[PDB]
Structures are given as structure tokens and as C-alpha cells.
Amino acid sequence: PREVEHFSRYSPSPLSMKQLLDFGSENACERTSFAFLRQELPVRLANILKEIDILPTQLVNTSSVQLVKSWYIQSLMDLVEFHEKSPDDQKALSDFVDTLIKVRNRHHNVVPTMAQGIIEYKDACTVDPVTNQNLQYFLDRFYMNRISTRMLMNQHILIFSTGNPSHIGSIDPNCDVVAVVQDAFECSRMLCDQYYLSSPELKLTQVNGKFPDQPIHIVYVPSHLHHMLFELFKNAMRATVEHQENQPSLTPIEVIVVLGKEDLTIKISDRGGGVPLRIIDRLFSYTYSTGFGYGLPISRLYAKYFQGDLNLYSLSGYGTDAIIYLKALSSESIEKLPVFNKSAFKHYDDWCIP
Amino acid sequence: PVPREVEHFSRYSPSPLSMKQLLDFGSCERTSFAFLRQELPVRLANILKEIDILPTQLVNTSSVQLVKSWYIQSLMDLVEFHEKSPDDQKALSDFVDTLIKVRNRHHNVVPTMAQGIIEYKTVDPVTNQNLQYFLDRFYMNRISTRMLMNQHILIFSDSQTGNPSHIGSIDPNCDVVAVVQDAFECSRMLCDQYYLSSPELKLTQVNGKFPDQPIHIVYVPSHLHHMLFELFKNAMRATVEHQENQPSLTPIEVIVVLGKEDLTIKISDRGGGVPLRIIDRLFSYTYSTAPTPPLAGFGYGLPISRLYAKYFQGDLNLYSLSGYGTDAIIYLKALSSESIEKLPVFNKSAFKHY
Numbered sequence: 242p243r244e245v246e247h248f249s250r251y252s253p254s255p256l257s258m259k260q261l262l263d264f265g266s267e268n269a270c271e272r273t274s275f276a277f278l279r280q281e282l283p284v285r286l287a288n289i290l291k292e293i294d295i296l297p298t299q300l301v302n303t304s305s306v307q308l309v310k311s312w313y314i315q316s317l318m319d320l321v322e323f324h325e326k327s328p329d330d331q332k333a334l335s336d337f338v339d340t341l342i343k344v345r346n347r348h349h350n351v352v353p354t355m356a357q358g359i360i361e362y363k364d365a366c367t368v369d370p371v372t373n374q375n376l377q378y379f380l381d382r383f384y385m386n387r388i389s390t391r392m393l394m395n396q397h398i399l400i401f402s403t404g405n406p407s408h409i410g411s412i413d414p415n416c417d418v419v420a421v422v423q424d425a426f427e428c429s430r431m432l433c434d435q436y437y438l439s440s441p442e443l444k445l446t447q448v449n450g451k452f453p454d455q456p457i458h459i460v461y462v463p464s465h466l467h468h469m470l471f472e473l474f475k476n477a478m479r480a481t482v483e484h485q486e487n488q489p490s491l492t493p494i495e496v497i498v499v500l501g502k503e504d505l506t507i508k509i510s511d512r513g514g515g516v517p518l519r520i521i522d523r524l525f526s527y528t529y530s531t532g533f534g535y536g537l538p539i540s541r542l543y544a545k546y547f548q549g550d551l552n553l554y555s556l557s558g559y560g561t562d563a564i565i566y567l568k569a570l571s572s573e574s575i576e577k578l579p580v581f582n583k584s585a586f587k588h589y590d591d592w593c594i595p
Numbered sequence: 596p597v598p599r600e601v602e603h604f605s606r607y608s609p610s611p612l613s614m615k616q617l618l619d620f621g622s623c624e625r626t627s628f629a630f631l632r633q634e635l636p637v638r639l640a641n642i643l644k645e646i647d648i649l650p651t652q653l654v655n656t657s658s659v660q661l662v663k664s665w666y667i668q669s670l671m672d673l674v675e676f677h678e679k680s681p682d683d684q685k686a687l688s689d690f691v692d693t694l695i696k697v698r699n700r701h702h703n704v705v706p707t708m709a710q711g712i713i714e715y716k717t718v719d720p721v722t723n724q725n726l727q728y729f730l731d732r733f734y735m736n737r738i739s740t741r742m743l744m745n746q747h748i749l750i751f752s753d754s755q756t757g758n759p760s761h762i763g764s765i766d767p768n769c770d771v772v773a774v775v776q777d778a779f780e781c782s783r784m785l786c787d788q789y790y791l792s793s794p795e796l797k798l799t800q801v802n803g804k805f806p807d808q809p810i811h812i813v814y815v816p817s818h819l820h821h822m823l824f825e826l827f828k829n830a831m832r833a834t835v836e837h838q839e840n841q842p843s844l845t846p847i848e849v850i851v852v853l854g855k856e857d858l859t860i861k862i863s864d865r866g867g868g869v870p871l872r873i874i875d876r877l878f879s880y881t882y883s884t885a886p887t888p889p890l891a892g893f894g895y896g897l898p899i900s901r902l903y904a905k906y907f908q909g910d911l912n913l914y915s916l917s918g919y920g921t922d923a924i925i926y927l928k929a930l931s932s933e934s935i936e937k938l939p940v941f942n943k944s945a946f947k948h949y
């Protein structure tokens with residue numbers, strides 16, 4: 242409808258982790274957050290809605306994609322309804338919390354519903370290299386967009402409706418990185434043991450280049466950090482178990498946590514045989530697995546969402562290294578947000594290739 | 596301007612050869628002659644076109660104008676052979692002498708081109724992304740024409756037979772670990788002159804392809820040596836300057852792994868790492884954190900080394916943990932049939948790029 246095209250004319254406004262903190266830690270003005278989000282969420286919903294229409298028709302027409310599209314247009318309409326209310330009407334502040342909760346429940350199944358559309362589409366139809374590349378591009382952007390809107394909405398929900406008191410919404414201002422590592426390792430070990438009757442141990446070490454004795458803390462969303470580590474541990478454990486199938490014991494998964502001036506980096510090392518350089522990129526493809534191959538690409542989105550990153554490099558025949566990079570300063574942890582614009586629409590032989 | 600024969604031969608694509616094919620004509624002089632007399636002018640004319648569209652204040656440096664002058668003469672020298680019959684023995688022999696002449700003429704191309712970049716700096720090279728793009732293609736083109744000519748010279752000349760165990764410059768049974776130790780020795784001796792000390796080598800090897808067997812592939816040892824040498828110089832500089840407050844130096848650790856498709860060499864140091872932010876700057880020509888002078892300063896080590904790795908469909912990557920150290924990693928195809936030349940082509944696509 243009209244509002245999809247109207248609000249798609251705005252570009253999304255990215256926030257730093259620091260802004261989110263500074264706002265909601267001490268002042269936490271419910272009026273301001275409400276005014277901000279009733280504008281911002283529609284803009285981000287409308288932007289990704291426009292981008293959906295660019296997709297191949299037999300993909301857009303799947304009941305899956307039509308579901309996502311309709312939930313989004315529905316959420317966008319719900320929210321826009323609050324532009325007529327005043328920030329001072331509290332039946333409005335209160336209903337907005339409720340509307341956000343409804344919206345978060347409505348999008349709960351967005352990821353797998355969209356994934357089903359893709360799977361349906363790829364199974365059924367033949368896909369040019371170009372189109373399969375556009376799908377990757379689209380999905381990184383669609384899922385990033387959902388990560389960002391979930392982030393914003395939960396901050397408002399948790400702060401003004403409640404969660405952990407040590408945290409400001411979903412943000413932990415003193416995130417104990419090492420402890421998130423151990424916790425994510427356990428979730429993985431549980432599943433590994435409950436499936437293979439065995440699992441590698443953790444060998445973790447840490448270096449605080451900043452204060453060489455200090456425990457390692459940064460501002461971060463531990464939930465996001467947990468998701469990345471968990472997925473990387475699942476992979477490293479499965480690879481270790483399957484590669485050492487003829488073994489008495491499993492080699493340890495080795496992790497090092499390092500804090501430098503501007504980076505926090507976590508390197509996870511396994512001796513699970515690796516994969517050939519030829520295959521690496523396919524790992525980060527949404528439909529590549531050997532339980533669905535969303536681990537790597539989604540984890541990489543969580544890493545990138547605040548200007549971090551996630552890389553794999555492997556020694557085929559021996560093992561694999563996964564590195565997570567996170568920004569160390571909260572001021573530089575700024576959302577990486579897709580905007581639908583000339584440059585993006587455009588995006589949808591140089592050397593001799595073998 | 597541009598001579599007719601350059602215009603003409605640049606209309607062809609170069610033809611990528613594999614290491615296997617290069618090996619093989621060391622197993623008919625006529626046929627190498629028929630190939631090279633055509634191919635070499637094609638590769639020279641292609642790159643001469645790209646030089647032609649270089650920044651006019653670059654193209655007009657005495658250095659670049661001189662390299663252009665050279666590439667033109669070599670092309671003509673070679674085109675003069677187009678009339679001769681491949682079974683004219685005086686021709687075949689004259690052709691060898693010409694390749695020797697041309698190789699001597701091009702001996703100073705690399706430093707002459709770099710010098711021109713120095714002079715050119717009314718600009719900033721590290722940031723100029725067209726200059727980087729051209730430099731990758733220029734140097735790769737040089738690597739490939741030297742390789743082709745040396746192969747012919749070392750196999751068919753009277754006077755230059757190269758290493759008797761090699762076929763041309765190709766070692767069909769390259770002892771990868773022995774080249775690692777040699778490269779490390781060279782770096783060690785340069786490091787000592789700058790620091791009166793240098794880290795030690797700790798090497799491990801895993802042959803997944805042929806367990807317990809020494810590791811061999813078909814490869815050009817001089818290229819591998821160049822790559823290893825440059826990476827070891829960086830690891831040693833980084834390690835020493837970072838650990839200068841400690842009673843001793845942590846070793847540089849190297850793992851060599853032969854897999855089914857890949858040979859992978861990982862070189863890990865504890866030299867303090869670099870922020871993720873400047874990683875890609877590291878592969879930019881002329882980028883250095885050392886003052887320009889030699890151990891470091893010209894900033895060619897990384898981009899050149901990566902060129903060598905990619906030339907035969909390999910690759911070179913750096914992953915760093917800022918505040919701790921860096922992993923440098925080389926990938927080479929383990930099969931000679933998959934080791935195929937990676938060559939620039941000047942065409943519509945390449946032109947769009949500038």
C-alpha cells in the first residue's frame with residue numbers, strides 16, 4: 242500500500258551500541274524511544290519490503306514469501322498507527338509496548354518461513370549463477386534487517402515493559418567474553434555427547450593486550466555472541482568427531498580470546514580435517530550443508546551487525562580456524578544496515594578463468 | 596601513441612597454461628616456438644593497452660615511459676619471428692637468443708615501475724584503487740611472461756640449463772619443507788642484521804594425502820621461496836619489535852599440510868597483530884608501517900607474494916589477532932593439472948573497472 246512506498250523513501254538510521262546504552266541506562270526516556278521507533282521501524286520494514294518485490298517471481302509467489310511479506314506489511318501498518326498518537330498519551334506508550342510484543346511474536350517465525358521459500362524455490366527451479374548470487378545478497382540483507390529490528394524493539398520492550406537487571410535491555414555493558422565462550426561450548430558439548438556419546442574438550446586461553454592482567458570485558462549483546470560461538474562450536478565438534486571416527490580420543494577444540502586496542506578477536510581451532518579452498522565460500526551459502534546451513538551465514542551477520550566480522554580459514558587434511566572479530570569500543574559498534582536505494586537496485590571477464 | 600602491432604595483438608585473449616602443460620613440453624622446440632612467438636606479443640600488447648590508459652601524469656614518468664618502450668621493442672623483436680618456419684633451426688636458435696635478450700631487457704622492469712610510482716607521488720598510491728588494480732595486473736603479467744620465456748630458455752638453450760632436477764623452473768618433486776627451512780634461513784640472516792636476533796622456527800607437517808610420506812608437489816620453488824621469504828620477514832620484524840621487553844623470543848610456528856586438493860602452509864607469530872581495520876591496507880602496494888628506506892618499507896612484500904600464490908590458482912591470506920599475533924596462510928593447488936595461469940585480459944570489463 243501507500244505507506245510501504247512512502248517510508249521506503251527514508252533510509253534507515255543506524256545506532257551505535259553506545260547510543261543504545263547512553264539511552265536507556267540512566268535517562269531512559271520512554272517518550273523519546275517511542276517517537277524514535279514509531280518512525281524507524283516502519284522505515285526499515287518498508288525498505289526491505291521494497292527489496293522483496295525485486296526477487297524472482299516464482300520465489301515471491303511462494304506461500305512462504307507471501308507470508309513474510311504480509312506479516313511485514315501488517316506490522317508496518319500497526320506501527321504507523323501510532324504517528325497519530327502523542328508521545329505524552331500513556332495509553333499510547335503502553336499500547337506501543339504491546340504492539341511491539343505482538344510484532345515480535347508475529348516475526349518469531351520469519352527466518353524459517355523465508356528459509357523455506359528459498360529451499361522451495363531452489364529445489365523447484367533452475368537458477369542462473371547471477372540469480373543465486375542475488376539470493377545470497379538478498380538474504381544477508383533481509384536477515385540483517387530482521388536482526389536490527391529485533392534488536393531495537395527488544396531494547397524498548399525489555400527496558401519499558403524486563404529481563405536481566407545487570408543488563409540494559411539485551412546489552413551487557415560488561416560482557417564477560419570468556420564466560421560466554423564456556424557457556425556456548427557447553428550447549429554444544431551437550432548436543433555432541435547426546436548424539437555421538439563423545440565430544441572434544443575445550444582448551445581456552447586469553448590475552449588482554451590492553452591491561453595484561455585484566456579479565457576481558459566489552460560492551461556487547463551476549464545473546465548475539467552466544468549464537469555465533471554456539472554455531473562455530475557445533476561445526477568444530479561435528480568435524481572433529483567425524484574426522485577422528487577411528488580414534489580413541491578427540492583432539493581438543495582450542496580457543497583463544499584476545500582484546501586489543503580496537504578489536505576483540507576469538508579464534509576457534511579444530512583438527513577436524515578442514516575443507517578444500519575450493520569449497521570454503523560455499524560454506525557461507527545459505528543452502529549448503531553436508532540442521533540447515535544457516536549457521537555460518539547468520540553467525541557472520543551477527544558479527545557484522547556492529548561492524549565486526551567472521552572468517553573461516555582451513556588447512557584441508559588437518560583442521561579449521563574460525564575467527565570472530567568484534568569492535569572493542571562501543572562508539573564504533575554501529576549498526577550495519579541495508580538501505581534500498583539506487584546503489585542497491587543497481588546491484589541486483591576481468592581475468593582469465595579456468 | 597600506440598603502434599599498429601600493439602593494437603592488433605591486444606585484440607586477443609592470453610591463453611592460460613597449466614603447470615602440467617608447462618611440465619610437458621619439457622618431456623618439442625618447434626611447438627613451443629610456434630606458441631610463444633604468438634602468445635608473448637598477445638600478453639605484452641594486452642598490458643601495453645592498460646598502461647596506455649594509466650594516469651597521464653604516471654604514464655609520463657621516465658620510468659613508465661621507459662618500461663613501455665621496452666615492452667614495445669620486445670613485442671616487435673618477437674613479431675619479427677612470425678615469418679620464419681618453426682622447423683628453421685637458425686630461427687629456433689635465434690629465437691632462444693631473443694628470449695634471453697628480452698628477459699635481460701625486462702630484468703629491471705619491477706624496480707623501474709616501482710620507482711615511477713615514487714615519482715608519481717602529486718597523489719596517494721595506497722588509496723588510489725585504480726593504481727592498485729593496475730599494479731596487480733601489470734606484475735602478474737610480468738610474472739607470467741618471465742615464466743613462459745624462462746621455461747623455453749632453460750629447456751632449449753645451449754648455455755642456460757638451470758637446475759638439472761628441474762624441468763625449466765619447475766620442480767616436479769618440490770620438497771616444500773626444504774624450501775620453508777631455506778626461506779626461513781634467509782629471513783633469519785636479514786633479521787639478525789637489523790636486530791642482532793631473530794625468532795626460531797618451529798615446524799610441523801601433516802601429509803593427509805600420503806600419510807607419513809614427505810610432502811611433494813609440482814611447483815616453481817623460486818616462487819614459493821619468494822612468498823615464504825616475504826612472510827617470514829614480516830613475522831620476524833613483528834615478533835622482535837613486539838617482544839623486545841621479554842627475555843626471549845617466541846618462535847615462529849609453521850605448519851605444512853598436504854590435502855587432497857590443496858597444499859596449505861600456515862605461518863603463525865606472536866608479534867602483536869594488527870587491527871582488522873588496516874588488514875586490507877596491508878596488501879596495498881607501498882603500504883608500510885616502517886619508514887621507506889632492506890627488511891621493510893617499500894610495502895611490496897604482501898601484494899607480490901599474494902600474486903605468486905594466485906598466479907597458479909592458489910591464494911594468500913592474513914588473519915590477525917590484534918594484541919597477540921598474526922596467522923599468514925598460503926594455499927597452493929596440489930594437482931599440477933589444476934594449477935592454471937591466472938592472467939589479466941584487457942577488454943570491455945577491464946576497461947569498465949578504471
Ligand SMILES: Nc1ncnc2c1ncn2[C@@H]1O[C@H](COP(=O)(O)OP(=O)(O)O)[C@@H](O)[C@H]1O
Nearest residue numbers: 476477480524530531532533534535536537561
Ligand atoms: N570447523 C569446520 N570443519 C569442517 N567443515 C566445517 C566447519 N565449519 C563448517 N563446516 C562445513 O561447512 C558447512 C556449513 O555449516 P553451517 O553453515 O553451519 O550449516 P550446517 O551446520 O547445518 O551444516 C557444514 O555442513 C560443513 O560441511
Ligand SMILES: Nc1ncnc2c1ncn2[C@@H]1O[C@H](COP(=O)(O)OP(=O)(O)O)[C@@H](O)[C@H]1O
Nearest residue numbers: 829830833877883884891892893894896897921
Ligand atoms: N606478521 C605480521 N604481523 C604484524 N604486522 C604485519 C605482518 N605482516 C605484515 N604486517 C604489516 O603490514 C605491512 C605490510 O607488509 P609488506 O606489504 O610486506 O611491506 P613492508 O614489509 O615493506 O612493510 C607491514 O609494514 C606491517 O606493518
Ligand SMILES: [Mg+2]
Nearest residue numbers: 472475476536
Ligand atoms: Mg552449524
Ligand SMILES: [Mg+2]
Nearest residue numbers: 825828829896
Ligand atoms: Mg615484508
